RNA sequence: GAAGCUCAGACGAGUAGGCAGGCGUGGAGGUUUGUGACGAAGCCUUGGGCGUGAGCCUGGGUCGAACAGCCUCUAGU
RNA sequence: CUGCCGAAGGCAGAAACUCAGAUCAGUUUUAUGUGUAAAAUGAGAGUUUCUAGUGGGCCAUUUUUGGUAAGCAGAACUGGCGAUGCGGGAUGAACCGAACGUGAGGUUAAGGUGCCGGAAUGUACGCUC
RNA sequence: UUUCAAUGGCCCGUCUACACGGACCAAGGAGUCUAGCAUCUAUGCGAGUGUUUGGGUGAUGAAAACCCAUCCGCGAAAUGAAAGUGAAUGCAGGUGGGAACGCCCUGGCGUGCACCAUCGACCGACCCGGAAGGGUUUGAGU
């Protein structure tokens, strides 16, 4: 039994066995859309540019 | 006395059949099944077996072992190599099975030879 | 499977190529300062447990088959079982007799000879 | 250690059973009996046939049936004058033990017939012979 | 044997025994022990420790209840005693 | 002693005043 | 013969998406994880306030020295911590008791607080688990099942999570996983090997930057 | 060859020293229906083969009368 | 001939048996003042017994006193050497890396990329005749 | 196999770098036998053990082998300067641990080898008493 050590990083049959989750993931998920809020505190932008 | 101490007196190294060499030993025994130093073959260091020579075969059993002239029975074959393997394979049902593959073999080289 | 040999080159003992008192058989450097013995660089190796090799094709003959000494006819047919992994080999001081008389059991046997043609 | 130092053909198929008995079971005891089967005889002093009477018929007692098993030689000791009835399967018994075993009360086994009637140990006093006693 | 010594592998690398009351029976031979112990005889066995090659006899052990004759040159003080009281007399052999 | 958590550090209080070598 | 087939094969289906929420919770919960840190920063960020982040529990330690010329002090450190070959890495419960132990194998070894990434990509590929003194590779869920089953981690993102996230179970998990063998490092280390990290060298601590190392080491 | 087979992992400088297994030489007991004047031993060889190694087998030539494997024993090894 | 274990400036090994332990650590925390006591991590920990070889010295390190044109002398610890081959410093007993079975591939350490010499007569900013 | 090309390579042993040996080759050549003692291992017997000082037989080679017999050696009893005396109280004493085993219903329970901690008695030599009894002295003792 394991004659030999496959990487399930390059060998996809193997991350399957190891990960039942890898069928359904979904990394790429969209949080931004567009509607993005600018948001730094004006105290925070003055010490910032200070000096 | 018996079989196993038949064995380790004789089988493990003092026997007229044994050829040993660089680290292997084989058997000149008429007897054997194999040519090679084991329990399941050796039939002086084990109970009944069989074994082919050029083709007639041996036959033992137990109950006459005390008596060397009658103790190996002989029967003759000179029909055909397919026939043989019959009679060998037949004769070999009702016996320990272990020993009918390598007994046949013998019979297909040995007829090979012929 | 096929045959690999690790080394070709026999280790000779250090010196040899330069006396004839000293015989090219291997002996182990004794010396406590000696460059073999303390394995410097450009020195004739030592023979090592690492050089063996490999056991499925040790003490085989370039074609897979173990040579396997023989001075009768009974020691030819004790190779009637093992003619695929064994190679008969005619013992030197066999006569010419019993070297063809051999030899020809031998090819009914269908068993390779290593010096069949001597 | 995995083999004895004797070169005996019976010891050697002693050790063969055991073996076997000690990885194919469960019993401490065989495992005992296999290591008691390595040791040396300076590590298997002989018991006498005295001590196996007092240990069989000490205290409580309670002997009844059990085998006493010794790795070793059951001496006899001829200054006790009765000898009860006794079962006792070791490697070697001296002909006066064996006689005197044998002639008044039970029997003497071999190691081959403990493990055909207690295989496992079950109901088996394991002596030991006394150490040291070095001269 | 000089084959499997060292250096054929260093080549190339440079009056009065005494006898305890415990084994008096056991010089009686078996015949006197199967015919006089554990039963009662008028006629009572005799121990020559004499003639066994012992001087004197001691005091380690216990006596079975039958009466015997023990013939000694010397004999232990209380061994005398575990004679009476086992029925028997020690009679001093000169 | 476990690592330090996280926690808050208000600086309308005091606010960070600049340090020079 | 059938019945106990299709018994075996239902519970261990039913093991399987045990496994799949599992893992699916434990990524689920990184990203909350990560989203409620960037949610603190910003919300801090806007109110002129200042956040500070968690100081991470967990830790990489690589040793970058070899055997030779070593104090014994150091050499008894690292023994303990099982770094007994250049390039070897460990994770380790970074505590109080832990910091002052590395402040004196620091010219030795090389340590920093590794990402998910890391040390998902480090357990797939150099993960070998110790079972019964013997270096087995994490081939399968079997033997993580069968070595770490009294601890309730049965899968490889259990492991994960428990040595992401330092565990209730942490030792036990780190104890069960060889020492890491990396290879040497592919573009080599800087021009200096032993200085100070912070001195352009590449020993002592080096946080975030670990994790740039392990790309390299792997 | 239970003195065996099989699976897995780790390991590999080495003096003093300790332990274990093997190669070779003379002679002895047992065995090999063992080899030999159709050529034993020995010797030479740019031939071939085996073993990590100690060493072993073999082709050709020379040569002329004895020699060897296996298990033990033994030593002026 | 080969393999394994392997020092020493009371050791290493062998055998006989404890406990699946809170049993030890060339270690770090906590508490009390380098001592002691009671969390981290690592490791299976041990006890009696006998029996080979050695008990030297060189180099450097940090702690002191006596010192002088000037070095120097005497202590304690630490390591390296000694039993240790390999890469580099043109070469080397003490300098920088690295502890050695036979090989294939990849990647580095130290040091290097004008030629001898495998590798940029690379990029960027200054100094110097 | 010879040879060339590139790379590497200081002459071996001894002795504390030097120094001493080394022109070459073949043969010979150095931890042996024996007496005692000790550890360990193996074999036989076992409170016993040891035939070969001796005797008998051995015919097929007879310096071998086989058989037989009383002494005697070591052990079975130790202590004391010596005369001497000269061992299970209590299952040949108990307590705890303890291998193995059994019993159930993991554990508990028994059960206890060897051995180890304890422990009482006994044999003595020492002391007091006139054998009993009292020491908390002692021996690689029961």
Same mark, same amino acid.
């Given at each position: 039994?394991?004659?030999?050590?496959?990487?399930?990083?390059?060998?996809?049959?193997?991350?399957?066995?190891?990960?039942?989750?890898?069928?359904?993931?979904?990394?790429?998920?969209?949080?931004?859309?567009?509607?993005?809020?600018?948001?730094?505190?004006?105290?925070?932008?003055?010490?910032?540019?200070?000096? | 006395?018996?079989?196993?101490?038949?064995?380790?007196?004789?089988?493990?190294?003092?026997?007229?059949?044994?050829?040993?060499?660089?680290?292997?030993?084989?058997?000149?025994?008429?007897?054997?099944?194999?040519?090679?130093?084991?329990?399941?073959?050796?039939?002086?260091?084990?109970?009944?077996?069989?074994?082919?020579?050029?083709?007639?075969?041996?036959?033992?059993?137990?109950?006459?072992?005390?008596?060397?002239?009658?103790?190996?029975?002989?029967?003759?074959?000179?029909?055909?190599?397919?026939?043989?393997?019959?009679?060998?394979?037949?004769?070999?049902?009702?016996?320990?099975?272990?020993?009918?593959?390598?007994?046949?073999?013998?019979?297909?080289?040995?007829?090979?030879?012929? | 499977?096929?045959?690999?040999?690790?080394?070709?080159?026999?280790?000779?003992?250090?010196?040899?190529?330069?006396?004839?008192?000293?015989?090219?058989?291997?002996?182990?450097?004794?010396?406590?300062?000696?460059?073999?013995?303390?394995?410097?660089?450009?020195?004739?190796?030592?023979?090592?447990?690492?050089?063996?090799?490999?056991?499925?094709?040790?003490?085989?003959?370039?074609?897979?088959?173990?040579?396997?000494?023989?001075?009768?006819?009974?020691?030819?047919?004790?190779?009637?079982?093992?003619?695929?992994?064994?190679?008969?080999?005619?013992?030197?001081?066999?006569?010419?007799?019993?070297?063809?008389?051999?030899?020809?059991?031998?090819?009914?046997?269908?068993?390779?000879?290593?010096?069949?043609?001597? | 250690?995995?083999?004895?130092?004797?070169?005996?053909?019976?010891?050697?198929?002693?050790?063969?059973?055991?073996?076997?008995?000690?990885?194919?079971?469960?019993?401490?005891?065989?495992?005992?009996?296999?290591?008691?089967?390595?040791?040396?005889?300076?590590?298997?002093?002989?018991?006498?046939?005295?001590?196996?009477?007092?240990?069989?018929?000490?205290?409580?007692?309670?002997?009844?049936?059990?085998?006493?098993?010794?790795?070793?030689?059951?001496?006899?000791?001829?200054?006790?004058?009765?000898?009860?009835?006794?079962?006792?399967?070791?490697?070697?018994?001296?002909?006066?033990?064996?006689?005197?075993?044998?002639?008044?009360?039970?029997?003497?086994?071999?190691?081959?017939?403990?493990?055909?009637?207690?295989?496992?140990?079950?109901?088996?006093?394991?002596?030991?012979?006394?150490?040291?006693?070095?001269? | 044997?000089?084959?499997?010594?060292?250096?054929?592998?260093?080549?190339?690398?440079?009056?009065?025994?005494?006898?305890?009351?415990?084994?008096?029976?056991?010089?009686?031979?078996?015949?006197?022990?199967?015919?006089?112990?554990? /039963?009662?005889?008028?006629?009572?066995?005799?121990?020559?420790?004499?003639?066994?090659?012992?001087? /004197?006899?001691?005091? /380690?052990?216990?006596?079975?209840?039958?009466?015997?004759?023990?013939?000694?040159?010397?004999?232990?003080?209380?061994?005398?005693? /575990?004679?009476?009281?086992?029925?028997?007399?020690?009679?001093?052999?000169? | 002693?476990?690592?330090?958590?996280?926690?808050?550090?208000?600086?309308?209080?005091?606010?960070?005043?600049?340090?020079?070598? | 013969?059938?019945?106990?087939?299709?018994?075996?094969?239902?519970?261990?289906?039913?093991?399987?998406?045990?496994?799949?929420?599992?893992?699916?919770?434990?990524?689920?919960?990184?990203?909350?994880?990560?989203?409620?840190?960037?949610?603190?920063?910003?919300?801090?960020?806007?109110?002129?306030?200042?956040?500070?982040?968690?100081?991470?529990?967990?830790?990489?330690?690589?040793?970058?020295?070899?055997?030779?010329?070593?104090?014994?002090?150091?050499?008894?450190?690292?023994?303990?911590?099982?770094?007994?070959?250049? &390039? &070897?890495?460990?994770?380790?419960?970074? &505590?109080?008791?832990?910091?002052?132990?590395?402040?004196?194998?620091?010219?030795?070894?090389?340590?920093?607080?590794?990402?998910?990434?890391?040390?998902?990509?480090?357990?797939?590929?150099?993960?070998?688990?110790?079972? &019964?003194?013997?270096?087995?590779?994490?081939?399968?869920?079997?033997?993580?099942?069968?070595?770490?089953?009294?601890?309730?981690?049965?899968?490889?993102?259990?492991?994960?999570?428990?040595?992401?996230?330092?565990?209730?179970?942490?030792?036990?998990?780190?104890?069960?996983?060889?020492?890491?063998?990396?290879?040497?490092?592919?573009?080599?280390?800087?021009?200096?090997?032993?200085?100070?990290?912070?001195?352009?060298?590449?020993?002592?601590?080096?946080?975030?930057?670990?994790?740039?190392?392990?790309?390299?080491?792997?």
């Amino acid at each position: 039994a394991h004659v030999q050590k496959k990487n399930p990083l390059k060998n996809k049959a193997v991350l399957s066995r190891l990960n039942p989750y890898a069928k359904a993931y979904k990394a790429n998920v969209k949080i931004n859309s567009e509607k993005t809020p600018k948001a730094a505190g004006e105290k925070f932008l003055s010490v910032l540019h200070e000096n | 006395q018996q079989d196993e101490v038949i064995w380790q007196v004789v089988g493990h190294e003092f026997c007229s059949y044994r050829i040993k060499g660089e680290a292997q030993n084989f058997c000149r025994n008429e007897y054997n099944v194999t040519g090679l130093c084991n329990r399941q073959s050796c039939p002086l260091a084990n109970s009944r077996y069989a074994t082919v020579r050029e083709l007639y075969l041996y036959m033992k059993t137990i109950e006459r072992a005390h008596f060397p002239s009658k103790l190996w029975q002989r029967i003759k074959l000179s029909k055909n190599y397919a026939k043989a393997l019959e009679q060998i394979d037949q004769q070999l049902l009702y016996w320990p099975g272990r020993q009918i593959h390598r007994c046949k073999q013998r019979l297909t080289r040995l007829t090979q030879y012929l | 499977v096929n045959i690999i040999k690790k080394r070709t080159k026999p280790f000779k003992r250090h010196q040899s190529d330069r006396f004839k008192r000293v015989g090219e058989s291997w002996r182990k450097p004794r010396g406590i300062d000696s460059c073999v013995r303390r394995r410097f660089r450009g020195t004739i190796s030592m023979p090592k447990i690492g050089y063996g090799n490999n056991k499925k094709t040790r003490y085989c003959m370039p074609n897979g088959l173990k040579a396997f000494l023989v001075r009768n006819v009974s020691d030819v047919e004790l190779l009637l079982m093992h003619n695929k992994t064994y190679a008969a080999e005619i013992a030197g001081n066999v006569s010419a007799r019993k070297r063809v008389e051999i030899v020809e059991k031998a090819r009914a046997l269908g068993v390779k000879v290593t010096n069949a043609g001597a | 250690r995995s083999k004895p130092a004797s070169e005996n053909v019976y010891l050697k198929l002693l050790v063969k059973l055991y073996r076997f008995l000690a990885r194919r079971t469960d019993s401490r005891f065989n495992k005992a009996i296999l290591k008691r089967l390595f040791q040396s005889k300076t590590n298997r002093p002989p018991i006498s046939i005295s001590k196996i009477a007092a240990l069989t018929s000490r205290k409580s007692a309670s002997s009844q049936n059990k085998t006493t098993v010794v790795v070793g030689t059951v001496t006899d000791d001829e200054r006790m004058l009765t000898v009860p009835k006794l079962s006792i399967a070791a490697l070697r018994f001296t002909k006066s033990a064996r006689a005197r075993i044998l002639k008044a009360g039970g029997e003497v086994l071999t190691l081959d017939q403990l493990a055909l009637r207690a295989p496992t140990g079950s109901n088996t006093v394991l002596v030991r012979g006394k150490k040291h006693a070095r001269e | 044997p000089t084959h499997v010594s060292k250096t054929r592998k260093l080549r190339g690398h440079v009056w009065r025994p005494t006898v305890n009351l415990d084994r008096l029976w056991t010089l009686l031979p078996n015949e006197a022990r199967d015919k006089y112990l554990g /039963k009662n005889t008028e006629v009572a066995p005799v121990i020559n420790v004499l003639q066994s090659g012992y001087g /004197k006899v001691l005091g /380690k052990g216990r006596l079975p209840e039958t009466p015997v004759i023990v013939q000694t040159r010397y004999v232990s003080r209380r061994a005398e005693e /575990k004679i009476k009281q086992a029925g028997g007399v020690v009679e001093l052999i000169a | 002693a476990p690592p330090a958590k996280a926690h808050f550090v208000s600086t309308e209080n005091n606010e960070p005043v600049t340090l020079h070598p | 013969i059938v019945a106990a087939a299709a018994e075996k094969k239902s519970a261990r289906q039913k093991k399987r998406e045990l496994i799949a929420k599992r893992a699916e919770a434990y990524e689920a919960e990184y990203r909350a994880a990560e989203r409620e840190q960037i949610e603190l920063a910003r919300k801090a960020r806007a109110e002129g306030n200042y956040f500070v982040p968690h100081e991470p529990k967990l830790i990489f330690v690589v040793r970058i020295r070899g055997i030779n010329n070593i104090p014994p002090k150091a050499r008894k450190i690292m023994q303990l911590l099982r770094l007994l070959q250049i &390039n &070897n890495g460990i994770f380790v419960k970074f &505590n109080k008791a832990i910091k002052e132990m590395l402040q004196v194998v620091e010219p030795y070894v090389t340590y920093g607080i590794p990402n998910h990434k890391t040390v998902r990509e480090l357990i797939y590929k150099r993960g070998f688990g110790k079972v &019964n003194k013997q270096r087995i590779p994490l081939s399968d869920n079997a033997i993580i099942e069968a070595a770490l089953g009294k601890y309730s981690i049965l899968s490889v993102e259990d492991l994960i999570h428990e040595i992401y996230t330092v565990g209730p179970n942490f030792k036990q998990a780190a104890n069960f996983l060889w020492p890491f063998k990396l290879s040497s490092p592919l573009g080599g280390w800087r021009e200096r090997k032993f200085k100070h990290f912070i001195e352009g060298g590449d020993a002592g601590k080096r946080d975030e930057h670990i994790n740039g190392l392990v790309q390299k080491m792997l």
